Amino acid sequence: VRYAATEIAPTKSARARGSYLRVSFKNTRETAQAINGWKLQRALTFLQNVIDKKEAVPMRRYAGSTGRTAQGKQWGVSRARWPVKSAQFLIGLLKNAEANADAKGLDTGNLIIKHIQVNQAPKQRRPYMSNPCHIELILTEAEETVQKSEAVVR
Amino acid sequence: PDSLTSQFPNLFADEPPPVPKILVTTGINGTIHKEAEEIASIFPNATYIRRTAHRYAYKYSVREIAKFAKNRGYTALLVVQEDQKRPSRLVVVHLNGEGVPPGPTLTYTIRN
Amino acid sequence: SDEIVWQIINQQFCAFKLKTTKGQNFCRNEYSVSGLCNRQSCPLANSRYATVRQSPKGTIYLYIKTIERSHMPSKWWEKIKLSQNYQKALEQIDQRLQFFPKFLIHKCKQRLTRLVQVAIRMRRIAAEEARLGEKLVPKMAPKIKKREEARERKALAAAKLERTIERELLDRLRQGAYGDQPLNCNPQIWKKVL
Amino acid sequence: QKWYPAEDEAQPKKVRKAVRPWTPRKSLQPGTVLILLAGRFRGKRVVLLKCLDQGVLLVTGPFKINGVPLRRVNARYVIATSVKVDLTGVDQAKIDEVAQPKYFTAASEEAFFKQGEKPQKKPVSSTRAADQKAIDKALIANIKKVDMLASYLASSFSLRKGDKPHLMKF
Amino acid sequence: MVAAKKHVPIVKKRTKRFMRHQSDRFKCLDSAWRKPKGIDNRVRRRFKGNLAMPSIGYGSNKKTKHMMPSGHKAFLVHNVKDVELLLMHNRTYAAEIAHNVSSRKRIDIITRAKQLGVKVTNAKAKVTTEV
RNA sequence: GAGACCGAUAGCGCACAAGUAGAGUGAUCGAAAGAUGAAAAGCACUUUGAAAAGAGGGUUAAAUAGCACGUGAAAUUGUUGAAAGGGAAGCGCUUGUGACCAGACUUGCGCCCGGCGGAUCAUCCGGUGUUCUCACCGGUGCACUCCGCCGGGCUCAGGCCAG
RNA sequence: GGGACCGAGGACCGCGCUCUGCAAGGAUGCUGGCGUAAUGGUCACCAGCGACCCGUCUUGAAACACGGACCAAGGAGUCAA
Ligand SMILES: [Zn+2]
């Protein structure tokens, strides 16, 4: 039979969740896709630069023609914006998972974001509807490989 | 533990056999050959033999194979029982040596 | 009034009738030569009838029903022991179901045939199951399986498995379990340990 | 037999299909060189000995010329070639012996422990090798007399460019 | 020799389900067959390249109707008394244990069918083998 | 006191804050909204941090039952994996490739020889019930007969696809 | 003489013939292969051919007009005289 790819061990992992966050789902989905599969320190610098209006977030799926700056040359996408609240909610979620990893005894300088996922929260019932979101994310240490012994003949 | 040594003299004796010889087989007319061979690679000096050759072959019992492998010189006999074409139970039988009978049988459950 | 009894059973209702979607109907009466709801093998519609049954002591009996005692269902069937010799047992049916409908003579021999081969088939698979010693047992109940799936999840977190392996491996290097000049480690690493 | 028929399984009716002898084609004669087209000896030229029943043909190489032993083959899987060799001196009694159907036809510790192992290649029998030599002894001596037949029978048949089998005369 | 009786070869005239028209496009329409009733419906007038309709010409052979690939007809069984109804028909029918039968009652059915020589379709659902 | 009634878009508008909340100057109009668990045992304590939120840990048979709470469909959405594509593609017939899943006849009977044991064997004894000639027990034994079991020997029948 | 497709039925019964049995009221014989896979199913994709809007309602014509964003639940010949 087939066997699915098993989960990396929980003591090598670190989890963080955010539910019912009053933040736009289309913007947070585009912000989370920008930093998926990055280093932890790489992501915290990028999301802080988005806060300080330095580096822009490309818009790919939920893309609206708002800005066309030269900062999109590093992504290849001609549409860019600056999600501030989406960066702030994702920063506090990444810092939460960094604190969780240190409680579990993980190496702070070598987490990567292997899993980020944005869902939709229930709509806030007020003709105008808000679009909140759920966010969950998992950090793990980089895969460490050790050397093999030379095989012994007998 | 004095109660354990008297009840099971073979496991808790002075000196075990130096190089244990282990035989791994499957459930009867099993289909988990790749899973049992990897379990055979877990324990050093272990060989895998399928329980039944063909679908319409002789239906050897665990009691028989324990007698057959003890004659050849094996130390333990392992049977991996399958459910849903996946390993589900591990039966560990201790064949021992010389004159003492095949010792305790420990059945386990392989879940994940 | 055997035809009238058949009209009520067949068209309206019978308590022994099992209806399948496969095209054949089945009779649940224990006194039926063939478990089918046809006219020739109804114990109810046929005032004179024969069947073959097996006692749990292993004795095969021939049950004969006559019309002259049909008003008393307690004294209805007469039980007649059949021989273990197969060709002799077939002759008792021919002798005792004399002047009966050919269907009832035929289906009593076939029911005799099936019951004798089942006993041989019973003794063969009992001998094989006593040889293997394997027995079918129920699997784990849904609630117990839900319990061990939940408590294994908590045990896996509480184990902290790769931390415990590292903790125990570093314990043995400290305590000198690997011996002097180990093939386990790197000599510039042992000089750190002193 | 022993049992009464326990079901309504009807017997088959009496079929009207009598077995009659197979009539081979006129091109198949004892001594005809044949070209094998299928099997493990495909493309090899061999010499026919006897026409058996139901389209089977008893054929030898002989073994010292090409490598094909005493064997059976089906008529439709072979091609007959116009060259015919002499069988003077070949033992018809020995050929009639190797033409029998029985000739080419035929729980413990060791049974359990050889489950999954590839069986070893059993060698040739004494009678199989001896009967081969007895049949071929008068055969290749016949083959040497006709010029270039030895290299013909040791060779393998193949098709070149422009070789159209509907126009080739065999 | 424990198998089904001698049966003529099973020929299925069509192995594919008749699917309702436009059921692939609209999720509200289930795939269960409904005959089209519009007078300009291209399926109804039976133009080429469209879905065929069910018809009595697709009907299977009466000798092999309701027969499993092994040659048996399925028999739904709820307890041990139902298997014994198959004592005389162990070559024509096969025991299909109902889905709401418990674990223990299934083993009683499976033991009984082996003694009677009756094939079981689902003999490994809630059971396991212990040595 | 009842029912071949309805079962939370049903049944009275209202199973619950219901002529309530809300609208209109007013006469009047008038909703939505049931279900944790057997028991709150309704998450102590550690640690993030400004929150209707996490990570540990605990209660419980179960917390993927945590006062967003039985089950938890579809539309719709995100992540992971496979494949494809550039105004394509979608449906019908027919193969091919890859992935996953399943797993074919359920695989047996019959003779001969030796030993062992039970019987429906013995014109054996005793008892019980019966439809009054049929069944069932208890005790005897192996001259005959018949069944099993064990140990040898032999034969036959077996599902499907080719040629 | 060469080739293709097919083998329905299932004790005997009939008409016959080249009469120790036959080609005469429907296929048997021999040999081989088949369980770490014979043989199927589902999904995805490529390929050849075909077709490419449904219900209503008119027309010589639907290439007219009306309805259709999607999904769940509700929803229309009933009961009395
Ligand atoms: Zn009936």
Could you characterize what this model shows?
It is classed as ribosome. The structure is cut from a larger assembly and holds chains A (154 residues), B (112 residues), C (194 residues), D (170 residues) and E (131 residues). By secondary structure, chain A is α+β, with helices and mostly antiparallel strands. Chain A has helices spanning 25-34, 40-51, 84-103; strands at 13-21, 57-58, 80-81, 111-120, 133-141. Chain B has 112 residues and is an alpha/beta fold. Helix content of chain B is 24%, strand content 27%. The longest helix of chain B is centred in the middle third of the chain and has 11 residues, at 62-72. Chain B starts with a helix and ends with a strand. Chain D has helices at residues 92-98, 101-105, 109-113, 126-145, 149-154; strands spanning 32-36, 45-51, 56-60, 71-74, 78-84. A five-stranded antiparallel sheet of chain D has the order 4-3-2-1-5. In chain D, a hairpin with an 8-residue loop joins strand 1 (32-36) and strand 2. Chain D is extended and about 70 Å long. The B-C interface holds B 28, 59, 61-63, 83, 111-112 and C 128, 131-134, 139, 148, 152. Bound molecules: zinc ion. Residues 9, 14, 16-17, 27, 37, 42 of chain C line the site of zinc ion (ZN). Chain E binds two RNA strands through residues 1-4, 6, 8, 19, 21-22, 24-28, 36-38, 40-42, 47-52, 69-71, 90, 94, 113-114, 117-120, 123.
**Biggest beta-sheet profile of chain E:** 3 strands, parallel
Largest sheet of chain D: 5 strands, antiparallel
- Oligomeric status: part of a larger assembly
Largest interface: C-E, 29 and 30 residues
Query: What overall form of chain E do the CA principal axes indicate?
Result: elongated
Q: Please list the strands of the largest sheet of chain D in the order they lie side by side.
A: 4-3-2-1-5
| End-to-end CA span of chain D | 56 Å
Count the helices of chain E. How many? 2
- Enumerate the strands of the largest sheet of chain E in spatial order, edge to edge or round the barrel: 1-2-3
Instruction: Give the SSE string of chain E.
Output: EHEHEE
Give a list of the ligands: zinc ion
Q: Radius of gyration of chain E from the CA trace?
A: 21 Å
Q: What amount of the residues of chain D lies in strands?
A: 15-25%
Q: Approximately how much helix is present in the residues of chain E?
A: 10-25%
Shape of chain D: extended
- Secondary structure class of chain D reads alpha+beta
Strand content of chain E: 5-15%
